[PDB]
Amino acid sequence: LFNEAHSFSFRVNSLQERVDRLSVSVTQLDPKEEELSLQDITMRKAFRSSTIQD
Amino acid sequence: GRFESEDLTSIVELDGLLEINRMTHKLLSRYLTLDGFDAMFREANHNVSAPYGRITLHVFWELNYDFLPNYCYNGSTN
Numbered sequence: 001l002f003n004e005a006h007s008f009s010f011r012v013n014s015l016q017e018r019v020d021r022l023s024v025s026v027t028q029l030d031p032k033e034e035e036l037s038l039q040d041i042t043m044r045k046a047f048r049s050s051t052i053q054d
Numbered sequence: 055g056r057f058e059s060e061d062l063t064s065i066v067e068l069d070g071l072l073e074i075n076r077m078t079h080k081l082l083s084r085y086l087t088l089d090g091f092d093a094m095f096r097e098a099n100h101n102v103s104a105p106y107g108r109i110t111l112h113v114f115w116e117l118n119y120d121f122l123p124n125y126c127y128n129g130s131t132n
Contacts, residue, residue: 036105039114046100049089 058108062116068109 037044057068072095079091099107 039106039111042100042104042111044100044104047097047103049097 058112062113062121 056071057064076091079088079094082088093102096102096107099109101107
């Protein structure tokens with residue numbers, strides 16, 4: 001149990017760092033910097049969620 | 055994809071099917087944990103990382119090609 005829970009502690013700590021970075025990044029967005037691409041552009045890499053089945 | 059393979063009149067079918075999917079997600083979320091239906095819909099519509107999704111692109115494509123040059127209006131019935 002201790003070994004397993006220690007792994008979760010590492011995962012939680014890593015997530016905490018990511019959230020702190022995102023919060024700093026999201027509180028800096030400038031609305032004037034937003035730009036939109038052409039209507040006929042589909043070259044953007046479609047986002048795919050993780051699908052790992054044990 | 056099914057909507058993308060038919061004319062603009064399939065919008066009602068897409069909305070009905072989407073409502074069914076949303077309700078199924080709500081039923082499954084009672085006992086399981088799942089991502090929000092909005093996030094999954096955006097993921098399937100390629101809208102999370104892009105300003106415009108697939109549905110709007112198809113609507114524009116249909117308007118330019120089929121709807122505009124193959125439909126006659128009637129103001130009496132709108």
